[PDB]
Amino acid sequence: ENIEETITVMKKLEEPRQKVVLDTAKIQLKEQDEQ
Amino acid sequence: ENIEETITVMKKLEEPRQKVVLDTAKIQLKEQDEQ
């Protein structure tokens, strides 16, 4: 499941790399709002 | 905390965009592991 699998990867990532993932999720929601 | 904030955003995303976020996390981990 996508969220559970993302949690598993993120638990291994240092905070700055987790922040990239979060900021990517925020862009994806902006793009979703433009569909 | 970044993981919970990412979950919150991902819960709003359509499944293909959730997969974008998971694949972004997987990329970050491959880079972290190669550093």
Automatic annotation (TrEMBL), chains A, B:
It comes from Lactococcus phage TP901-1. This is CI. It comes from the Viruses. Transmembrane segments: none annotated.
